[PDB]
Amino acid sequence: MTSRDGYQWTPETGLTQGVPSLGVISPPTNIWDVIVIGGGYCGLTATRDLTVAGFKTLLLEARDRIGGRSWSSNIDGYPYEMGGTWVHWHQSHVWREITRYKMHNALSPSFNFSRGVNHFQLRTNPTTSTYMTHEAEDELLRSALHKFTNVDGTNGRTVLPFPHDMFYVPEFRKYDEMSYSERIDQIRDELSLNERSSLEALILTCSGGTLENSSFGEFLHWWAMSGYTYQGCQDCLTSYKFKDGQSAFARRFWEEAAGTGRLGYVFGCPVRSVVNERDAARVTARDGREFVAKRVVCTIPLNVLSTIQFSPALSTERISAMQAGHVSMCTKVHAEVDNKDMRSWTGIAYPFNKLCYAIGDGTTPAGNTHLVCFGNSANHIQPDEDVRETLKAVGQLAPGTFGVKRLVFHNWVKDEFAKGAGFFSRPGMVSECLQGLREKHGGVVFANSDWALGWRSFIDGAIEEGTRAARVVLEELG
Amino acid sequence: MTSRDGYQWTPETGLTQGVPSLGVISPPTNIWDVIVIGGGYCGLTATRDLTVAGFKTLLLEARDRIGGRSWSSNIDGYPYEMGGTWVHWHQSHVWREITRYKMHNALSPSFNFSRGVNHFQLRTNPTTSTYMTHEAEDELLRSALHKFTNVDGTNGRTVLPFPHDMFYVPEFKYDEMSYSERIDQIRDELSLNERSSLEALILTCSGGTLENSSFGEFLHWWAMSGYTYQGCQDCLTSYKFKDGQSAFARRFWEEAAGTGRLGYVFGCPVRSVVNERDAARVTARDGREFVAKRVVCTIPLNVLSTIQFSPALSTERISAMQAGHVSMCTKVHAEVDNKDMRSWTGIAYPFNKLCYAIGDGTTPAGNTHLVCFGNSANHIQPDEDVRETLKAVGQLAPGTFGVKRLVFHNWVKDEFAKGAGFFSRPGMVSECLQGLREKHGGVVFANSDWALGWRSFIDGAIEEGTRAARVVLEEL
Numbered sequence A: 001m002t003s004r005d006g007y008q009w010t011p012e013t014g015l016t017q018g019v020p021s022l023g024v025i026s027p028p029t030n031i032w033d034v035i036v037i038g039g040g041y042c043g044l045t046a047t048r049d050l051t052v053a054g055f056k057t058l059l060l061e062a063r064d065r066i067g068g069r070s071w072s073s074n075i076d077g078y079p080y081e082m083g084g085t086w087v088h089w090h091q092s093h094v095w096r097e098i099t100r101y102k103m104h105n106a107l108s109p110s111f112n113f114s115r116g117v118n119h120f121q122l123r124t125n126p127t128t129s130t131y132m133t134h135e136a137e138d139e140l141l142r143s144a145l146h147k148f149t150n151v152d153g154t155n156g157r158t159v160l161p162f163p164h165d166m167f168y169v170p171e172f173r174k175y176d177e178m179s180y181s182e183r184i185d186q187i188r189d190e191l192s193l194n195e196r197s198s199l200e201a202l203i204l205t206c207s208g209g210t211l212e213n214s215s216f217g218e219f220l221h222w223w224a225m226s227g228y229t230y231q232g233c234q235d236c237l238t239s240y241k242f243k244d245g246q247s248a249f250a251r252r253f254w255e256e257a258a259g260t261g262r263l264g265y266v267f268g269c270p271v272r273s274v275v276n277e278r279d280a281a282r283v284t285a286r287d288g289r290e291f292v293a294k295r296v297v298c299t300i301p302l303n304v305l306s307t308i309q310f311s312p313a314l315s316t317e318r319i320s321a322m323q324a325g326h327v328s329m330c331t332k333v334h335a336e337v338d339n340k341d342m343r344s345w346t347g348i349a350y351p352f353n354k355l356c357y358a359i360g361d362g363t364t365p366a367g368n369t370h371l372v373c374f375g376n377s378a379n380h381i382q383p384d385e386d387v388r389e390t391l392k393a394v395g396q397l398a399p400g401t402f403g404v405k406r407l408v409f410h411n412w413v414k415d416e417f418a419k420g421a422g423f424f425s426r427p428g429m430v431s432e433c434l435q436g437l438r439e440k441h442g443g444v445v446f447a448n449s450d451w452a453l454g455w456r457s458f459i460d461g462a463i464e465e466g467t468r469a470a471r472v473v474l475e476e477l478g
Numbered sequence B: 001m002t003s004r005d006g007y008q009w010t011p012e013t014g015l016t017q018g019v020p021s022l023g024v025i026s027p028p029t030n031i032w033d034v035i036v037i038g039g040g041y042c043g044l045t046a047t048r049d050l051t052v053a054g055f056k057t058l059l060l061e062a063r064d065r066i067g068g069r070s071w072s073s074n075i076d077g078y079p080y081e082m083g084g085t086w087v088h089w090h091q092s093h094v095w096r097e098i099t100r101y102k103m104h105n106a107l108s109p110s111f112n113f114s115r116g117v118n119h120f121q122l123r124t125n126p127t128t129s130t131y132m133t134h135e136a137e138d139e140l141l142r143s144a145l146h147k148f149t150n151v152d153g154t155n156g157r158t159v160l161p162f163p164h165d166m167f168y169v170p171e172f173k174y175d176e177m178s179y180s181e182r183i184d185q186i187r188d189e190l191s192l193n194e195r196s197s198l199e200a201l202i203l204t205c206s207g208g209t210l211e212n213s214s215f216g217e218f219l220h221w222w223a224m225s226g227y228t229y230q231g232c233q234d235c236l237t238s239y240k241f242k243d244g245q246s247a248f249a250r251r252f253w254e255e256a257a258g259t260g261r262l263g264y265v266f267g268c269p270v271r272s273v274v275n276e277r278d279a280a281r282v283t284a285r286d287g288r289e290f291v292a293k294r295v296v297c298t299i300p301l302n303v304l305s306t307i308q309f310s311p312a313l314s315t316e317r318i319s320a321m322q323a324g325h326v327s328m329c330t331k332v333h334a335e336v337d338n339k340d341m342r343s344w345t346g347i348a349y350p351f352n353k354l355c356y357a358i359g360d361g362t363t364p365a366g367n368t369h370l371v372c373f374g375n376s377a378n379h380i381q382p383d384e385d386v387r388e389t390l391k392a393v394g395q396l397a398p399g400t401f402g403v404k405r406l407v408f409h410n411w412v413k414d415e416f417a418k419g420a421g422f423f424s425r426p427g428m429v430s431e432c433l434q435g436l437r438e439k440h441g442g443v444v445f446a447n448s449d450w451a452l453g454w455r456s457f458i459d460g461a462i463e464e465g466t467r468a469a470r471v472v473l474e475e476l
């Protein structure tokens, strides 16, 4: 079935809107102890746990599909990941689900260095390139990340020995409150143009944001979770994905919950408001339908929360985090290209290009190379707005070496039910607001990867919070 | 509440059997869809999942306590860890249960390098000692581990890139190699200090001999932890529960009890499990019988050959259960009278019966706590002779301290474990893992000893109990 979300470009079709996904649900409805709002991995986990536990549970989702910020579209036999893609066995919650659903053997490596150009292309201005081996690229990035993360002499192991508890060492706060830009100022003279340029392209790819608005300590938190090394980051952040696409993973949550007979759902049904009453909570759809339950688990993202009317009023901390919003305006564009030899190419083009980091990520059945490309707020592009501009950005990663047969993307920035990609905090935002983002609010439990403790902003964080939400409901309802 | 398990020794009281544990269940009984045999983490996870899901579940346990190969004993306000101890957030299953139980902030570091002697004491013969900084110790072990693991150019990343699927690269002959054969290939590139360090470390993991420990199984621990020395440190020996493993076991127990669908009997060892046409029948040593539609059997690999199963098990199960795994790990705690040894570590190898030890804590009375390990190459049964056990301890740092207390449990002689944590013979995992995992009519065999990931860890137990509950759920 084909979803309203996403885009494709080919020479024969031009830009078209809406792409196939296994996440699309048919029919869109089948009609309460609990209402779960939103069917990303947070809502899916929570729904899976509550129904399995005996609770009569109703899923309300705005879109036509499950998966939220993470979903895949099969096109000519190749799964394009529109959002969240990479996982690893060091990510506790997603891994626990992969293995429980027997999908531990259903992964593919993104990297494949076994043939082709087998080099890293670094571009620091528009007219020229530098080329290196992947070993050389590793030495350059490790050297840069070393200097970047070494604020305590142990690359963050002293200030943040327990990433799940940011305040164990109170000096950590100073870094949460520091921006990319501030940190770089302290090491600027110790970095080459090549180390600085790679570093910034890489950390801005993580944050989606700008050097001024991304929290250095949020990055130290990612670093710490991955084991405080460059190799641990590579492994956790961009090495392994689902051979059949993320939406096949989401379908396992969905089939489990459906299979209980305790699941109610409605898709294409955006929520306008959630009001606490005496016995219960009343949820109102934009289309005016109404639904009542003893508890509501609300998994709407941080950047979307200000569109919803809550009663009573949220706290000051919830209000200001939601008004400032997180900074990830990440653009992710997929290109199926006609150069077979670029399977083993990787590339950074920074700061002059609207896509700054890219990798060869696979081979389609038709034998073309699949490139995935990322850009951020520091040099932003809305990839749907001018196909010719998007193609320039893709080609400037490796000028004069391929033609594009196809583009595939979803625009997370203009999507009204995301308004941003995965969470990434402003300087000071997590230390100031995390506690307020996680607290109870009547019979409303707020749960989203955006405010997880461990892998915050990943699929793993979304599953952590879905699990938490289910346990809170379980304790309170019995 | 005291357990039949464990031992304690002091100068004043001598050697006494039985020690306290939060894991002791009293009253032992409260009397089916499902019978779970075993109350270690595997069974606890399986029971927690089955109950929460609505199944009428019977738990039968041989011991007077839950936790199996992992439990803690609170003595004068200090948790002694009789078996499985360390966890990390890179261990998916234990970490998931830790955060879901809100215990993510209830851990503490074993290592404290802020005061005290702050050195590593290496002993390669009975008459001397070499002393280093902890930095130099890290350099020495990193160098030894690099040479040991570097079979493929990338420290195992090429032959074992997906530890959960050992056959992904067929070249992964390493499973069929012993510690001994691996060291033979790199013998000439290792100094005495690198070799002694390395052998002590690797034998502390396996609890076995150089000739009977799979090199490949070690490559697997090493891959699971990230292929680095530092990753092994983080995963294997850094963080433990402030309140002891038994307080974590209690959370699973309270959750399953709270459902109202839990039946249970402790001190109830099982002799047979028979598959009938409708159900499966489980008979205790004393003759009591219990019937369920399904059975989750979590008895350890080394105890299985004591059980009659109907019908016969595959040749693979039988071979593995008859050969057994090689971990005969001896683990000894000492409360000692030297405060400066909080930051001490030592290896004494090959001449001592405990070869590896660390400052792990400080009791409420203000004394240093040392945890000490021995293997099968120079083995001691710590209960047989207290004075030999004290000597084994003293010789880790001769002349530097007196022993106020010992605490330990003999896992080897324990009829419901017959070994410690799983660790395999060369080839045993290649040959038998598939067998050890296949269904047996109405009986699901689950145990950390044949998990795919953190096999032989607490994590591996929770992996397997989760699997078992998914399987039973799928079938009923």
Ligand SMILES: Cc1cc2nc3c(=O)[nH]c(=O)nc-3n(C[C@H](O)[C@H](O)[C@H](O)COP(=O)(O)OP(=O)(O)OC[C@H]3O[C@@H](n4cnc5c(N)ncnc54)[C@H](O)[C@@H]3O)c2cc1C
Residues within 6 Å of the ligand: A037, A038, A039, A040, A041, A042, A043, A060, A061, A062, A063, A066, A067, A068, A069, A070, A082, A083, A084, A085, A086, A087, A237, A269, A270, A271, A272, A299, A300, A301, A304, A330, A331, A332, A412, A416, A417, A418, A420, A421, A422, A423, A447, A448, A449, A450, A457, A458, A459, A460, A461, A462
């Ligand atoms: C481009 C991109 C790349 C990423 N890369 C990775 C990666 O490699 N690895 C990784 O682990 N993570 C990655 N992430 C992040 C990960 O995908 C998300 O953090 C995770 O999916 C968040 O899940 P969630 O359930 O907390 O929130 P969401 O998936 O955002 O789910 C929230 C749900 O609420 C619904 N909703 C919104 N408004 C309403 C409303 N008004 N009424 C009803 N429903 C509503 C939404 O439609 C959505 O279904 C990436 C994200 C993006 C966007």
Ligand SMILES: Cc1cc2nc3c(=O)[nH]c(=O)nc-3n(C[C@H](O)[C@H](O)[C@H](O)COP(=O)(O)OP(=O)(O)OC[C@H]3O[C@@H](n4cnc5c(N)ncnc54)[C@H](O)[C@@H]3O)c2cc1C
Residues within 6 Å of the ligand: B037, B038, B039, B040, B041, B042, B043, B060, B061, B062, B063, B066, B067, B068, B069, B070, B082, B083, B084, B085, B086, B087, B236, B268, B269, B270, B271, B298, B299, B300, B303, B329, B331, B411, B415, B416, B417, B419, B420, B421, B422, B446, B447, B448, B449, B456, B457, B458, B459, B460, B461
């Ligand atoms: C000394 C030592 C140190 C270790 N170090 C660590 C560590 O640091 N970190 C870590 O993660 N792991 C460690 N391990 C491993 C970890 O403790 C075990 O792998 C894990 O606890 C096993 O869990 P399990 O539920 O699969 O097996 P078990 O805990 O062995 O449970 C099996 C249950 O079966 C019961 N049983 C046996 N026979 C019968 C019978 N006939 N009838 C009824 N019941 C029976 C047993 O009493 C037991 O309760 C260690 C183990 C030991 C011994």
